[PDB]
Amino acid sequence: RSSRAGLQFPVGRVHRLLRKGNYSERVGAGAPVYLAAVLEYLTAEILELAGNAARDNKKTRIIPRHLQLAIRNDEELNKLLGRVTIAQGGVLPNIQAVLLPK
């Protein structure tokens, strides 16, 4: 079904998880496809930005720091993951202007 939907994320598995997560008595054929597509897309957006940060830092491997930079520097991702802690992410560099010397 993933190939039929043109996806990389596993439609069958998502369907099974929907069935066994006790979300509803019945599940439509399109629901796990839609969900898988959304999960895949969001994964792609975060990985895109994190990859960008990694290259800005001249690193070829994405680490948690890059994920944190990607998320917090993007308003909508930052909104979506507003109450989420990225382990080993650190924080954005930011010093209040009043604290700097005159």
């Binding site: 109450r83 989420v84 802690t85 990225i86 382990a87 080993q88 650190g90 924080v91 209040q96 604290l99």
Partner: protein, 87 residues
């Protein structure tokens, strides 16, 4: 049947320079002397609350080992979702 030395007063292990480092990452330039004790109290409360829930999950599962997932669930249900420790 060879238990560790009984744990006491370990909140003091959260040292003044450690709290300073945390504050620095938080962007703090200057720190009142009374902050450190205050911080300890706050931290302890936070920890207590998380660990309580975590242990509750552990107890529900009839386990004697607190798992990463126990902690993750406690944090999630306290509105402090943590990424990186599943599986």
């Amino acid at each position: 049947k060879r238990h560790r030395k009984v744990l006491r007063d370990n909140i003091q292990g959260i040292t003044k320079p450690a709290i300073r480092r945390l504050a620095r990452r938080g962007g703090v330039k200057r720190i009142s002397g009374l902050i450190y004790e205050e911080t300890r109290g706050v931290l302890k409360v936070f920890l207590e609350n998380v660990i309580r829930d975590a242990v509750t999950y552990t107890e529900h599962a009839k386990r004697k080992t607190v798992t990463a997932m126990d902690v993750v669930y406690a944090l999630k249900r306290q509105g402090r979702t943590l990424y990186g420790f599943g599986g």
